[PDB]
Amino acid sequence: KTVVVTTILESPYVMMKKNHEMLEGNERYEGY
Amino acid sequence: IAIAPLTITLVREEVIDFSKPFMSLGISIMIKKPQKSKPGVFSFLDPLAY
Amino acid sequence: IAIAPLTITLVREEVIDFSKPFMSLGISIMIKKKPGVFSFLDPLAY
């Protein structure tokens, strides 16, 4: 099964990738 | 599940389940990095004590 | 129930239920925390 790993946008916990326009899936977000 | 930096509070623990903390943290203080202070007028006597 | 300074470890966790940590610690270091009267002659040898 697929688990929805919900998270909040906070620094330095989750950055918004600067090249996320062509990214999809789990690759959009990177962080702690 | 929620992988987020959530503070383990009493009201949250009563309604959700919290595991062991993955980081230790507390309240701290912000100050500016000490700048070079302007020398005093009578700062030529500094090398030797009063 | 055991109320003692017990560290929450992986081997202990799988067999014993550990409550919320009441204190935080870690490995630290410590060290051991009067000029002579005629110390003005120090720059040159006797």
Taking alpha carbons only, the member of A20, A31, A18 closest to residue A9 is: A31
Contacts with A, B 1-20, CB within 8 Å: 1-5
Query: Cα–Cα distance between A28 and A16 in angstroms, integer?
Result: 7
Q: Is B34 annotated as a binding residue?
A: no
In the structure encoding, which two tokens stand for residue B29, read together?
């203080």
Resolution in A for the shown PDB structure?
A: 2.8
**Per-residue 3-state assignment (H helix, E strand, C coil) for chain B:** CECCCCCCCHHHHHHCCCCCCCCCCCCCCCCCCCCCCCCCCCCCCCCCCC
Question: Which chain B residues touch C8 with a CB distance below 8 Å?
Answer: 20
Query: Cα–Cα distance between C28 and B14 in angstroms, integer?
Result: 35
Contact across the interface for B18 and C20, Cβ inside 8 Å: yes
Way it was determined: cryo-EM
Contact across the interface for B4 and A32, Cβ inside 8 Å: no
Count Cβ atoms below 10 Å from residue B21 Cβ, excluding itself: 13
